[PDB]
Amino acid sequence: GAISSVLNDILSRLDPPEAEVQIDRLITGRLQSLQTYVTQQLIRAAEIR
């Protein structure tokens, strides 16, 4: 949902007033990806166990 996917782009373009609008979209997108992945691992670990 941000203007770019790279963390190094927003740190080189936008101010920390305008980066916290954009980096927190990257953090939420990467945390939900990890909360997707840990969900996919625990269900798979319940299959292996």
């Binding site: 782009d9 080189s12 373009r13 936008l14 101010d15």
Partner: protein, 242 residues
């Protein structure tokens, strides 16, 4: 560009390509008059740190009431009709007042504007057409008359008018960013190139932490940045030596 003698009109505005020079906005502070200053896609404090590939100056003179119309997503006789900005516009808008030069005692009719336009044209488009607009159902046949108005009118440019009626100069900067090789970079002095060590690199404004090593990759002459699966910049090109 910013301190020129006479600008052009809004329907036909000069687009000078800014290439291979030093973007130093501290030179303009000797004679500064900048009324509004907004960068929509970027931030102004990174103008010395980040530098841009293809800078294009959009220089024209309009009425002072319609300067806010120069924005991505607005309307007006300037925004909706002849000078439209894109939806993905990553750029800066620089505008300032021109009462001391562009205001004539009798009137400055050399700066025309477009009042009648048939449809909604694409952004970044110039229109030099002087065709008679058809506001009614009758064909105009290129002459004036009833429901046939000449589309290029002029504002009242006098120093005794209202300040919203006073002409404001404006130069809008547009660029492609962080995908292309950069030719214009400002007065930030480059440092020595260090290999095989975790450093804080800065290539064409792109800042980050990485390790610089030699590679067998050969970039195409239009290509500057190499990326990965994770979309982050995996490789850059040295702009000084090949």
């Amino acid at each position: 560009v910013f301190n020129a003698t006479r600008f052009a009109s809004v329907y036909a505005w000069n687009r000078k390509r800014i290439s291979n020079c030093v973007a130093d906005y501290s030179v303009l502070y000797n004679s500064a008059s900048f009324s509004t200053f907004k960068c929509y896609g970027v931030s102004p404090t990174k103008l010395n740190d980040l530098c841009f590939t293809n800078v294009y100056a959009d220089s024209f003179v309009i009425r002072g009431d319609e300067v806010r119309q120069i924005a991505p997503g607005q309307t007006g006789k300037i925004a909706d009709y002849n000078y439209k900005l894109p939806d993905d516009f990553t750029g800066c808008v620089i505008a300032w007042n021109s009462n001391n030069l562009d205001s004539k005692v009798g009137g400055n009719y050399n700066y025309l504007y477009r009042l009648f336009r048939k449809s909604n044209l694409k952004p970044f488009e110039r229109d030099i057409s002087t065709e008679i607009y058809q506001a009614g159902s009758t064909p105009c046949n290129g002459v004036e008359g009833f429901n046939c108005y000449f589309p290029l009118q002029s504002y009242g440019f006098q120093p005794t008018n209202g300040v919203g009626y006073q002409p404001y100069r404006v130069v809008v900067l547009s660029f492609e960013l962080l995908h292309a090789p950069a030719t214009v970079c400002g007065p930030k002095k480059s440092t020595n190139l260090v290999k095989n060590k975790c450093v804080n690199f800065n290539f064409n404004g792109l800042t980050g932490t990485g390790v610089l090593t030699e590679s067998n990759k050969k970039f195409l002459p239009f290509q500057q940045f190499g990326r990965d699966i994770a979309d982050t910049t995996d490789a850059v090109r040295d702009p000084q030596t090949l």
